[PDB]
Design an enzyme around this catalytic site. Structure first.
Site, PDB file in Angstrom:
ATOM      1  N   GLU A 196      -0.949 126.751   5.709  1.00 54.84           N
ATOM      2  CA  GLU A 196      -1.531 128.090   5.729  1.00 54.84           C
ATOM      3  C   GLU A 196      -2.478 128.331   6.901  1.00 54.84           C
ATOM      4  O   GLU A 196      -2.359 129.336   7.602  1.00 54.84           O
ATOM      5  CB  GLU A 196      -2.276 128.368   4.420  1.00 54.84           C
ATOM      6  CG  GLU A 196      -1.414 128.351   3.163  1.00 54.84           C
ATOM      7  CD  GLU A 196      -0.856 126.972   2.840  1.00 54.84           C
ATOM      8  OE1 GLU A 196      -1.613 125.980   2.952  1.00 54.84           O
ATOM      9  OE2 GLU A 196       0.335 126.881   2.460  1.00 54.84           O
ATOM     10  N   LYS A 252     -13.718 107.481  16.786  1.00 59.37           N
ATOM     11  CA  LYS A 252     -14.697 107.630  17.855  1.00 59.37           C
ATOM     12  C   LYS A 252     -15.363 106.279  18.108  1.00 59.37           C
ATOM     13  O   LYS A 252     -16.317 105.904  17.422  1.00 59.37           O
ATOM     14  CB  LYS A 252     -15.743 108.676  17.453  1.00 59.37           C
ATOM     15  CG  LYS A 252     -16.703 109.090  18.562  1.00 59.37           C
ATOM     16  CD  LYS A 252     -17.599 110.235  18.094  1.00 59.37           C
ATOM     17  CE  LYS A 252     -18.530 110.722  19.195  1.00 59.37           C
ATOM     18  NZ  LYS A 252     -19.307 111.920  18.768  1.00 59.37           N
ATOM     19  N   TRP A 268     -12.235 107.946  22.478  1.00 59.75           N
ATOM     20  CA  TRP A 268     -11.407 108.329  21.338  1.00 59.75           C
ATOM     21  C   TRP A 268     -10.111 107.542  21.221  1.00 59.75           C
ATOM     22  O   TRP A 268      -9.477 107.200  22.219  1.00 59.75           O
ATOM     23  CB  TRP A 268     -11.080 109.821  21.389  1.00 59.75           C
ATOM     24  CG  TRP A 268     -12.292 110.694  21.346  1.00 59.75           C
ATOM     25  CD1 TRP A 268     -13.000 111.169  22.412  1.00 59.75           C
ATOM     26  CD2 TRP A 268     -12.963 111.168  20.174  1.00 59.75           C
ATOM     27  NE1 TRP A 268     -14.072 111.911  21.976  1.00 59.75           N
ATOM     28  CE2 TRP A 268     -14.074 111.926  20.606  1.00 59.75           C
ATOM     29  CE3 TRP A 268     -12.736 111.024  18.799  1.00 59.75           C
ATOM     30  CZ2 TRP A 268     -14.957 112.542  19.711  1.00 59.75           C
ATOM     31  CZ3 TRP A 268     -13.615 111.636  17.907  1.00 59.75           C
ATOM     32  CH2 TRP A 268     -14.713 112.386  18.370  1.00 59.75           C
TER      33      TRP A 268
END
Lengths: 533, 514
Positions: free
Chosen positions: B322, B433, B438
């Site tokens: 959605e 992290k 990353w």
């Protein structure tokens, strides 16, 4: 009602060019200038230069809502204008360079254009009307250089400017009608309207525009935004080939084959000349697969001639007025089984209403007429890109819609159960008899069915009471028939008394044309006053 | 001031699709396989007439403009009629997922305050169990010919044909809730404008390429992203529709594929994997199928190759949720057609390009675009006519939905290249992290699950540092080299909590590294 959580956003033409610059930046935009030279650029460059055009126009005093006009043909600078003007909140007024100098001055003054961008080869025209323009403050030649008193497009470009987004219902462009009512009427388009139209018309059953296509807009960009092709082509990232003013067959074939054009759109006259050239030279276009024809209803033979060369032909209908394109032709899946002749007749029909368009063929009451492909009615429309009136013209505006809100096209037609609409030539075929319409073609085709008739040509003749009445020029099949025989033969065909020809004349032959078609032109003048009209 | 246009005041409305379909393609079929396995046949003309009667019946039941009417069912003609009737009368179609727990269903039905519920017969046991927890449903309609005591049958609920009731295009036409998100379900309310525009933008040639000549089979549930707007879009173009019902097993689908001449279909990876296994083992091929779209889970490279080897063009799509609807579709650029099979396959394996009317960017926590090198990680942020700007009845979720500049934060991590291609990776939270740097857990685990000795691998971030829970067991060194040849600690288990329930794993090994 119940509020949605959808974010507040507006549709905007500029988005097409920005998307194109980011995803299809290297796709080419090729243009043949009036000199015949071929210029090459890309969406990335067009985007950067268009941002500079917004800056330059701003430097010249153009602001949100101001009108900027063009008098030019299809080429990259006109494409940059197509995005720069709307992108900065301004209104692109596209003027037809083939109109008389007086009409051009009239529409430019009516729209109160503040700036005018025009092609070099039109300088003589501009120079002649310059003194009659009351609002143009800057004349910009779409070239590298310009004469004294004129500004060069390349020099007018300034610092890149960010776009200035306006409500989607705000105007992005405008164009005036002509040769119709007589007096040019202005129609103002919005971003919403053009963005929606570009989407609705580009589906598979429409133009089927794709990033892999090579699009060549023969339709002038000064008409109905060239079928929105310049916009739609940009949206999908298609390569564009802008022909400039040279629309002669040889010139087009050169672009078609040289650039690998897969899709094109234009008017019947250009296509007829192209067909004649290809057929006599025996040359075939290797890459061309889809051809759209708009404007004059394309004749049956035109579609057949191109189809015989592997090119799929699709008709389209729209007005310079309200809507650019509201009806497009394609063959329904279950109608693919029709015979070549029947399918040809189908393709020869105007087409089916496209998405987002509500259409009906009604009478003076706004009531739908029978879907028998015979009953005549006026095409009436509703939709996002259908005008609801005109700019600065109360009289034309007040009588544009029906009580229930539909736009009156002024076009007469018939429609069938399959949904197909067929615009009827209100001149060469229709007889306007007292606010009512009669097809001369239907009457004559029925008459030529009678055994005693060898050839029959029905035409409209001036009349005192009603405006026009039908007159039939018969060519007997031996023993000439009686007007009563022919009247019953028509009654047994579905025609009512009020539509039966008032008089039947006879002859040994009917003036033909180069195409061997009835030269009704002559007949209309011969029996000009046969009914005392 | 902005110059006024002369364009007429009009609104976009979903009902127009069905009306247009009834007028121009009235005889095109809508075929449905019910839960019993029987095949029902109808046409747009009939669906249009019955839909008008559904609006009358719902009105007779007290449904008015803005009221929510919910459905708990699968893809079949009655669900299609509801798809148009509810929005057509100005009401809001709340589509609920029948596979959610009874508790979550009662919660979303109570939160949306649905006034009427339409559900499939085979879900009666579920509905009967939660009926007492529903504070607002006033009428329970079974989507069948007959219904038990206390329930109303759909065919009997139908009343007199009613004309549609047009509402502003920005008004709600439907809504759906998010799920799986650690917190409370979030409601997203769609508008006519949003769905109409989306149906156009996604159906172009470079998209689903929907045409009147197509035979469309929506395997994607109508209770998910509106089945990709396929029911709406297919209607718009007048395409024949084949609604499969609940039975999504291979044999059942093949039967519909061949029996009805399906040319286009869309679904999730699991259904397609089962289908590919079936076709390959049996040696049977689908004669008419030409295009297949896969959404939801990123389709694996082999899945695309297996179907492509069978003549079926595969196209990925991102937005089977959605919050992030269909906003990205994959297709090969014209100048990239020259790539090698392997490279092109890798291209097709990417999520895709942003579709028309969608502004997309992959940015950092500042909302600044990250490098388009296909390596720099960033969050997918969006702007568009069908992108939500908040949530229904949930201030907290709504206030932090947009970036200062107005983009919606999907919560999805990805990379993008100079060609515009977006490649959906790990999910924001599940990210690792490690010291101002990353690491994608998804990339690591996908690679690990490639090793023969690994059946299942789930990489998660642990306080300190990625940790891999693996399922003869390999050595941490073997797996380390298998990753090095692809571009700390390895735990083992006999199974990983599903629904990868990394939520639990993060807590179990909360202090595994300290």
């Amino acid at each position: 009602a119940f509020p949605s959580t959808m974010m507040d956003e507006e549709l905007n033409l500029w988005d097409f060019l920005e998307r194109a610059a980011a995803l299809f930046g290297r796709k080419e935009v090729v243009s043949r200038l009036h000199t015949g030279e071929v210029h090459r650029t890309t969406y990335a460059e067009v985007y950067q230069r268009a941002r500079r055009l917004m800056g330059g126009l701003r430097a010249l005093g153009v602001g949100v809502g101001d009108r900027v006009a063009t008098l030019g043909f299809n080429h990259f600078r006109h494409l940059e204008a197509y995005f720069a003007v709307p992108g900065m909140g301004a209104v692109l007024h596209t003027a037809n360079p083939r109109l008389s100098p007086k009409e051009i001055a009239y529409i430019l003054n009516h729209a109160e254009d503040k700036v005018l961008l025009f092609d070099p080869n039109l300088l003589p025209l501009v120079e002649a009307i310059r003194g009659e323009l009351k609002t143009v403050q800057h004349f910009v030649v779409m070239d590298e250089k310009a004469p004294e008193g004129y500004l060069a497009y390349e020099e007018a470009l300034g610092e890149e400017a960010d776009p200035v987004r306006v409500p989607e219902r705000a105007a992005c462009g405008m164009a005036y009608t002509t040769g119709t009512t007589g007096l040019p009427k202005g129609v103002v388009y919005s971003h919403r309207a053009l963005v929606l139209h570009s989407l609705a018309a580009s589906l598979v059953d429409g133009t089927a525009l794709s990033e892999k296509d090579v699009v060549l807009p023969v339709v002038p960009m000064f008409h109905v935004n060239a079928w929105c092709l310049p916009y739609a082509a940009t949206l999908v990232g298609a390569k564009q080939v802008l022909p400039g003013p040279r629309l002669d067959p040889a010139s087009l074939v050169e672009l078609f084959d040289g650039e690998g054009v897969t899709f094109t759109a234009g008017v019947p006259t250009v296509w007829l000349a192209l067909a004649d050239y290809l057929e006599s030279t025996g040359h075939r276009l290797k890459t061309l697969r889809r051809l759209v024809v708009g404007g004059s209803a394309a004749p049956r033979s035109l579609i057949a001639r191109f189809e015989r060369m592997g090119v799929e032909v699709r008709q389209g209908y729209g007005l310079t007025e309200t809507s650019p394109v509201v009806v497009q032709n394609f063959v329904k899946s279950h109608l693919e089984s029709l015979s070549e002749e029947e399918k040809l007749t189908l393709k020869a029909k105007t087409g089916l209403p496209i998405p987002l368009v509500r259409l009906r063929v009604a009478d003076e009451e706004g009531r739908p007429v029978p879907k028998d492909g015979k009953a005549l009615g006026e095409v009436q429309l509703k939709g996002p890109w259908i005008t609801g009136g005109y700019y600065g013209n109360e009289e034309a505006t007040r009588s544009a819609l029906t009580p229930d809100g539909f736009f009156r096209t002024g076009d007469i037609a018939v429609w069938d159960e399959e949904g197909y609409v067929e615009i009827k030539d209100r001149l060469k075929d229709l007889i306007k008899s007292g606010g009512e319409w009669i097809s001369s073609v239907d009457l004559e085709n029925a008459l030529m069915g009678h055994p005693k008739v060898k050839e029959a040509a029905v035409v409209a003749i001036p009349h005192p009471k009603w405006q026009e009445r039908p007159l039939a020029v018969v060519v007997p099949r031996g023993e000439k028939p009686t007007p009563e025989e022919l009247n019953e033969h028509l009654l047994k065909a579905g025609f009512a008394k009020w539509q039966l020809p008032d008089a039947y004349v006879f002859a040994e032959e009917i003036p033909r044309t180069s195409a061997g078609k009835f030269l009704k032109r002559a007949l209309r003048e011969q029996y000009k006053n046969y009914y005392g009209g």
